[PDB]
């Protein structure tokens, strides 16, 4: 829709901050803090998927808005997902251990903007077509 396409990360604020509120290790932060991947998204049917690529790790999930899914995260967090759209916005939020995060996703101008809070940390990734 809006979100089909090849986008490439252009822009990070807060990222570090971000994974030390979700308990990631220095390795680890060191690794995903220097990745620029893409995000290719693509829709088929009730389906929709979004594959992360990059040099050291990549990832992928694909669900049907409303219906929550196992994911295994970057980091390696086993958590319940589910993504809605809201106005525009896929909205998924990450539920484990009592925990969760949000993860934000709406097109502004030329820019996929992705907004990613944990607890008082707000973090804003770019991303551009490529
Ligand atoms: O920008 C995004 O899509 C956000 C979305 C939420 C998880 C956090 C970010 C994903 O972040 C990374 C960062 C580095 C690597 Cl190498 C990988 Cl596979 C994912």
Redesign the pocket.
């Known amino acids: 829709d809006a979100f089909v396409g090849t986008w490439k ?1 252009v822009s990070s604020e807060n990222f570090d901050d971000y994974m030390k509120e979700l308990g990631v290790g220095f390795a680890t932060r060191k ?2 803090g220097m ?1 620029k ?1 893409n ?1 290719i998204i693509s829709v088929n049917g009730d389906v929709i998927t979004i594959k ?1 690529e ?1 040099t ?4 992928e999930i694909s669900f049907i808005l409303g219906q929550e899914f196992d994911e295994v ?2 980091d390696d967090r086993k958590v319940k997902s589910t993504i809605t759209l809201d106005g525009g916005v896929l909205v998924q939020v990450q539920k484990w251990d009592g925990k969760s995060t949000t ?1 934000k996703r709406k097109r502004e101008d030329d820019k996929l903007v ?1 907004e ?1 809070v944990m607890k008082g940390v707000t973090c804003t ?1 770019v991303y551009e077509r490529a």
């Not at 050291?56 to 990832?59: A, Y």
């Open positions: 990360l690794m995903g990745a991947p995000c992360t990059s050291l790790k990549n990832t995260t970057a993860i992705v990613c990734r």
